[PDB]
């Protein structure tokens, strides 16, 4: 009986593969061959932030494109004024072990996901000037790999436990749970419309979930190893995904297939963070090669190299207006490029 269900299941995955094959008239390269090259990019460092002592692990840009939140392996969350390199706030984190941080779209709140399985929300605009701890979100039975603000009242959190969650902040209840994944959800990204999001797990499969019902609208495969970073394309019809096989892939949502592959023989180590630039033409991927790479989003060709850190790049973030890209690395410095 179980083998019978296994035969139906893979009877339909076969049909799904056939459907994905029916759409593939030509790859992206065959149509984008006529596009003019972007040109060699000489992006240089403009700011270096001498902040945390030990290790930077996550970094997120505020919607103002000026305030910038950074998180450390042990210690505090530092909120920078990126224009003048000031330290607007220092948050004395309860749990030292951090894996993700998020800045609210309104700017009133921040969140440190933490590796202690407890998402900690911090209210910034407090009467007594000190950053207070608002209702902590507990009950995810796994380390919070990534957390993202839907809005001031709704957050989406990815856990080492395969279940992604959506929390209502006033009451702290896990108001929605997405369980379609089989592996540990390493990365998560929210579409610009915020109507739905995507997440990638260790099973080399990305899944596109919607926040209102929770049903898994689509699943994408193709990667040979764990998916560690996903970034939505700015328009929202596509999303790029990095993996330990050192290959960025640009999946499409209204389509359902690979559609692109970003790999070169010179780079072996796996990707760690992806962030489409504004207008989507450039994809910036950090590597364990002690380095960062600027890929053409339309041509499978390297546009430039940053190469300005002494330790592994923790994360990348492009401002909402695209003015500059902050690269936070395992070396304690966070460097802003443009």
């Amino acid at each position: 009986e179980l083998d019978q269900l296994r035969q139906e299941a893979e009877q339909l995955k076969n049909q799904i593969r056939d459907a994905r094959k029916a759409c593939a008239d030509a790859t992206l390269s065959q149509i984008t061959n006529n596009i003019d090259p972007v040109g060699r990019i000489q992006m240089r460092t403009r700011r270096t932030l001498r902040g945390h002592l030990a290790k930077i692990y996550a970094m997120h840009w505020g919607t103002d494109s000026r305030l910038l939140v950074s998180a450390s392996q042990d210690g505090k969350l530092i909120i920078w004024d990126s224009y003048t390199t000031n330290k607007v706030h220092a948050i004395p984190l309860r749990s030292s072990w951090v894996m993700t941080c998020a800045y609210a779209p309104s700017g009133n709140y921040v969140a440190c996901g933490g590796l202690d399985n407890i998402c900690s929300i911090y209210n910034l605009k407090t009467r007594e000037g000190n950053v207070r701890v608002s209702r902590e979100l507990a009950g995810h039975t796994g380390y919070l790999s990534c957390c993202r603000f839907l809005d001031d009242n709704q957050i989406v959190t990815s856990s080492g436990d395969t279940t992604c969650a959506l929390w209502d902040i006033e009451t702290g209840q896990q108001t929605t749970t997405f369980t379609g994944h089989t592996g540990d959800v390493m990365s998560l990204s929210l579409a610009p419309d915020t109507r739905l999001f995507v997440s990638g797990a260790c099973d080399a499969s990305a899944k596109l979930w919607d926040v209102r019902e929770g049903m898994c609208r689509q699943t994408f495969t193709g990667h040979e190893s764990d998916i560690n970073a996903i970034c939505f394309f700015p328009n929202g019809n596509a999303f790029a995904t990095g993996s330990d096989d050192a290959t960025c892939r640009l999946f499409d949502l209204r389509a359902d297939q690979e559609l692109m592959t970003y790999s070169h023989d010179n780079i072996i180590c796996g990707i760690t963070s992806v962030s489409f630039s504004k207008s989507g033409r450039l994809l910036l991927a950090g590597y364990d090669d002690f380095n960062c790479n600027v890929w053409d989003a339309l041509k499978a060709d390297r546009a430039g190299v940053l190469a300005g850190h002494d330790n592994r790049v923790s994360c990348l973030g492009v401002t909402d207006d695209g003015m500059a890209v902050a690269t936070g690395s395992w070396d304690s410095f966070l460097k802003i490029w443009n």
Partner: protein
């Protein structure tokens, strides 16, 4: 920029607090704690405390210790253990009584070999090269009570000793320390403990002190 001078003042005060707290934390020693389920880590952690991630704080003649209990995480260890790279001690707790036990919900994989496999995965992981492992062969008494009848050959078929306690526990220590391949750089501080007031806190203090001094003598190239 008449008001931004106050912003720079806030930045300098925050930087000062950052540096003081950072030096205070870099003053302290960070010790990992890991092992198989029911390895007896509870008794060990209770002894040092008497003197998600569970952080336990204890002091033994200054040199304030922060201990991190990790067993609580049933998840992918490969993407999690890339943290804890700055720990100056990795307390590995394994119970010698595991040699006799066939299963841990794991297809009749002997708990001892499951522990050795985890030790192999964690000791030789390329994140940890300078971090030293402190090996607690826990429940020495229950092992001494079991070995008197049930031969270690049920766990280690190549063992040919007389099943006497010393010749058995010395074999387990020898095997665990030979399981460490990169012995040129790493050190294994094997110790035998049980549910009594041992020197296990004193032994952790001594091993941590020695590893600290070894690290500092590497910093200046004296060693």
């Amino acid at each position: 920029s008449a008001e931004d001078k106050a912003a720079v003042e806030r930045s300098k005060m925050i930087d000062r607090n950052l540096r003081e707290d950072g030096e205070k934390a870099a003053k302290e020693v960070k010790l990992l704690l890991l092992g198989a389920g029911e390895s007896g880590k509870n008794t060990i952690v209770k002894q040092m405390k008497i003197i998600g991630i569970v952080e336990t704080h204890f002091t033994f003649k200054d040199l304030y210790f922060k201990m991190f209990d990790v067993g609580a995480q049933r998840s992918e260890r490969k993407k999690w253990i890339h943290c804890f790279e700055g720990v100056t001690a990795i307390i590995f707790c394994v119970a010698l009584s595991d040699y006799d036990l066939v299963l841990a919900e794991d297809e009749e994989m002997n708990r001892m070999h499951a522990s050795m496999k985890l030790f192999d995965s964690i000791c030789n992981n390329k994140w940890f090269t300078e971090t030293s492992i402190i090996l607690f062969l826990n429940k020495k008494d229950l092992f001494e009570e079991k070995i008197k009848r049930s031969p270690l050959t049920i766990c280690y078929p190549e063992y040919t000793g007389s099943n006497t306690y010393e010749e058995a526990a010395a074999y387990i220590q020898c095997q665990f320390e030979d399981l460490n391949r990169r012995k040129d750089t790493k050190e294994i501080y094997t110790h035998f403990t049980c549910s009594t007031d041992t020197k296990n806190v004193q032994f952790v203090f001594d091993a941590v002190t020695d590893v600290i001094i070894k690290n500092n003598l590497k910093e200046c190239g004296l060693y």
